[PDB]
């Protein structure tokens with residue numbers, strides 16, 4: 001698994017740096033991210049590209065396949081990562097035109113971070129919804145290293161426990177988002193008997209989500225073994241098409257989303273799932289999915305973090321759908 | 326059975342400020358971020374900027390030639406006098422499953438509602454005929470309109486730009502200054518010396534100058550005509566707002582800079598090729614593909630068309646107009 | 650004025666799976682408020698399952714019996730007001746097999762142990778249910794709640810009956 | 816002064832091309848007009864586009880051409896360098912060009928019978944009308960590239976296997 005990456009020249013006219021990882025090349029101009037590899041090329045609008053890059057970076061390559069689009073993306077092997085062009089595209093695959101290279105994770109991650117920093121300009125926050133931030137177009141103009149360097153938040157057991165990830169407040173830098181302005185902020189009444197204060201614990205989870213400063217970013221709020229509650233607030237469009245290497249579940253907590261569901265392997269449309277408050281559904285391990293949300297909404301993503309699953313799904317010793325009836 | 330004309334102005338939403346519309350079994354709704362489409366048995370979403378840009382083109386081109394795909398799902402087919410609106414017709418997945426839906430209209434009936442949608446959905450300071458760096462944003466609730474931007478007169482040469490009575494050359498004085506991304510382009514008139522009596526047929530003009538002054542993007546506009554041969558040059562920036570599936574061969578001559586054409590199969594939508602063209606490159610887009618263009622810098626392109634209405638049948642009953 | 654739309658026992662609106670080329674059964678689609686509404690008070694119906702882990706939905710109404718578990722659990726109030734009572738078990742192994750998984754119904758009678766405390770949850774509040782504690786709920790009016798847990802003696806499965814088959 | 820609009824030239828062009836996912840490069844009929852003109856003989860009209868009867872032809876102007884005439888309108892676009900167009904209104908155009916025929920006709924070096932119409936001087940990006948009923952000629956001091964909008968005819972040279980991308 002490869003380790004060879006490289007900083008290339010700052011372009012004289014655009015002001016941006018070009019980058020290499022193995023056989024892949026990365027360049028941006030005023031409008032586009034330009035990708036090349038041995039045998040081919042591809043273009044992605046720079047806004048779409050930066051939003052997706054932002055997620056793959058923040059999520060540490062996430063689970064399974066993170067498709068930037070119908071051609072380009074990554075596969076997390078957990079310590080190692082595959083970067084591909086056309087691997088999950090029927091046209092490229094049938095023709096033997098797909099290309100992929102396997103990297104050590106910190107090697108690809110370091111160049112991804114360099115790309116994201118160089119290509120992000122003053123006043124553009126690739127983690128926000130489009131109504132909340134500026135534009136990525138034009139030549140290099142300052143940076144937004146603060147927006148792209150946010151510290152990952154993960155509970156070890158539950159938000160708000162002594163020594164675990166904290167509750168969000170105005171004082172610690174997390175006010176309520178404009179599109180959650182009406183959401184009740186009161187904490188639950190907690191009254192512990194003496195000596196038990198460490199273990200009698202509750203928090204307002206919806207109010208916590210109302211204060212999230214980013215969109216489309218599942219964060220662990222409670223843990224039971226490998227079972228992770230990873231809620232997040234969402235607005236506009238999930239910047240990737242997620243092809244998981246395990247089953248996963250969505251519970252809509254507020255407002256609504258439609259999931260565009262396509263075949264993981266081919267990319268062919270298969271279904272559209274509309275979920276309103278209280279709806280819970282499952283995403284099979286053989287699909288990819290991408291969500292859409294008009295108003296900023298609350299979503300619970302529920303994961304099983306077990307590393308045994310992908311080889312089981314591959315072998316057929318675990319089902320591609322968790323339940324049949 | 327005949328073509329259809331039933332269209333309707335549905336209700337105005339009180340929070341978003343926008344009106345929704347119906348054409349046949351299709352409903353049309355936009356909110357802060359999206360265009361939401363419904364037909365009998367199905368639904369679809371398109372980001373509102375992409376949709377408005379694509380809608381702008383279909384209106385302005387009077388449904389154009391053959392297929393105007395807004396995306397991998399939704400679009401129109403021109404039959405010249407009549408027009409088919411579709412969901413999934415040129416998408417292998419919908420089609421294999423029998424989930425594609427199409428409705429055939431009288432062209433005038435469909436256009437009238439398209440113009441109403443385009444008018445209502447376009448807000449102040451947003452121009453869907455412009456490149457992103459040139460204009461504002463379409464997001465959020467209704468806030469005024471930009472009816473002037475979506476009401477631009479088509480320009481079409483009968484014979485050639487600048488001939489007496491024909492479509493005029495562009496100048497600062499007639500509202501057409503040089504675009505910022507063509508600032509360096511030379512703007513001299515050719516030398517034209519006519520003998521007495523012949524001043525109406527001794528004619529020449531600066532074509533590159535004319536294009537450098539176009540106030541819109543991706544808008545093939547006739548500059549010269551020989552029978553059915555039409556020279557339709559245009560200035561291009563960002564992405565062509567549609568994936569065009571033509572009912573004939575059309576030719577591209579790159580006049581300045583660079584365009585990359587994403588080429589997909591017309592029926593399925595499968596990627597087939599990517600075509601890079603720099604100044605002086607000429608190529609043919611076959612009848613069996615659809616294509617979408619990418620231009621970083623505003624660039625000059627000649628679209629060469631054969632406007633003969635006999636071609637679609639002749640091609641259906643070669644696909645590339647030169648066999649070798 | 651911004652309105653954030655939340656569900657409730659007597660006020661929800663199911664979406665669903667629209668099909669292009671699939672089986673709606675693959676998406677195991679239900680609404681937790683509907684599931685809770687049709688169930689016996691404190692009946693814990695699986696609405697999500699991944700291997701051994703589950704999410705359960707329940708209507709809180711009146712006072713529950715006591716529960717305890719060999720691992721941590723979490724409860725999220727989804728609708729009305731739910732009171733949680735916590736009791737530190739003297740001998741938790743007397744009520745819960747340490748090798749078992751998922752919640753165990755340990756009887757309506759007060760188990761032997763010390764008072765840990767009391768929690769009052771409203772909609773969107775999550776509380777911890779720690780291993781070694783016994784817990785019970787009190788709701789004045791019907792309210793909905795969810796459990797992050799493991800499938801066990803209390804887990805009611807009825808997929809064909811709650812999920813969309815279209 | 817940062818904006819640079821890239822125009823091609825006989826001596827300075829950079830050909831693009833066709834990348835294949837699943838197709839035949841030949842279907843795209845890809846060539847560069849500057850390359851075509853640079854390889855052609857002076858004033859040889861090589862077809863670079865064809866759509867049924869209609870053509871776009873590429874040529875290198877160099878010195879003075881012989882005279883041409885046509886049964887229909889044509890247009891010429893100058894693509895690189897200065898080209899002079901001479902126009903003559905023919906007394907009897909049917910004596911030089913068959914009407915109901917199509918494409919340009921080469922009518923000889925000798926001056927045809929008629930009246931002086933006018934003179935046009937074209938530079939890069941300039942287009943002129945070549946009007947039906949006229950004879951036209953070109954003069955170019957240095958090699959210059961040009962394009963004709965016309966119909967397949969007597970002067971139209973076809974060589975797609977040589978000019979286009981076959982691989």
Ligand SMILES: O=[N+]([O-])c1ccc(O)cc1
Nearest residue numbers: 216217218232234242301
């Ligand atoms: O991959 N996914 O299913 C996701 C990822 C991010 C998000 O906010 C919601 C869902």
Ligand SMILES: O=[N+]([O-])c1ccc(O)cc1
Nearest residue numbers: 543544545559569616628
């Ligand atoms: O036919 N086409 O795909 C087009 C349409 C518009 C344009 O500006 C260039 C090419």
Ligand SMILES: [Fe+3]
Nearest residue numbers: 242244248289
């Ligand atoms: Fe996912």
